[PDB]
Design a protein around this ligand. Structure first.
Ligand SMILES: [Cl-]
Ligand code: NA
Ligand code: NA
Ligand code: NA
Lengths: 151, 149
């Protein structure tokens, strides 16, 4: 006997050890990240983070380093970002209290609002505006932090 | 000739910061044939509507000036238009590491969603891009601290 999970873990390990990020991702796509062994969370999260379209600036800004010392929450954050579950990544970021991760998740959430088809134009616009205001607030906080550190 | 009027309307929109309106005004036209200043308008408009903080948008677009080479403007227009293959080829021609890496990542996504490619061809392409990305990442880490000596 059926142990499809057991097998996918071995399979993702084989692909990861070869840097086959995309293939790791599709191997694991039907599986809940919260129940994965820590090494498998590591493989998946690394795979998502390695393939996230970040500019050099974004890259400098966000906590996108993943190691076998990195806390589970950071791995879950990047896995949800990777799966386009920005709502889930947003509330993780807030729990973590990582400013730039909240901002990054707010940006992905903005896109999802922009594309949402169930929302009317007015509810749409209101929400984008709420988001941009929150982003600007955090951006203001980052700037003031950097100002104090240069004093 | 409606082309000329599009350039004029895109200018009218650009000067009001109506970046997304600039983009739609020019959507049908080829970027290579556009006058330098319109390439600037379009490139800037794509950058100003990317998913980035305001500060990040400023940082990229403040680097795009009317003394900037046409190539950097074409790069951003391709990115903005999801012509990531084209952005990548240009990026390698420019020989700027950062633009190659960003374009690879966006190209990866183009492949990921390409309907014409078969199941197996898609995967082999992604496998290749994935390995290249690891290679750039390994070089990134090595530059950060060479640990000599
Ligand atoms: Cl993917
Ligand atoms: Na490989
Ligand atoms: Na970083
Ligand atoms: Na500029």
């Amino acid at each position: 006997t059926a142990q499809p999970k057991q097998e996918a873990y071995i399979q993702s390990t084989e692909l990861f050890l070869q840097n086959k990020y995309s293939d790791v991702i599709t191997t694991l796509e039907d599986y809940a990240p919260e129940d994965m062994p820590y090494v498998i969370q590591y493989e998946l999260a690394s795979s998502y983070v390695m393939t996230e379209s970040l500019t050099e600036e974004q890259r400098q800004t966000v906590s996108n380093n993943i190691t076998l010392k990195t806390d589970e929450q950071y791995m879950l954050y990047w896995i949800y970002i990777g799966r386009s579950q920005s709502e889930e990544a947003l509330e993780l970021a807030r729990t973590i209290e990582d400013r730039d991760l909240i901002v990054y998740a707010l940006l992905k959430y903005r896109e999802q609002i922009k594309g949402d088809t169930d929302l009317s134009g007015d509810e749409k616009q209101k929400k984008l505006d709420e988001i941009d205001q929150e982003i600007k607030e955090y951006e203001r906080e980052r700037k003031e932090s950097e100002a104090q550190l240069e004093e």
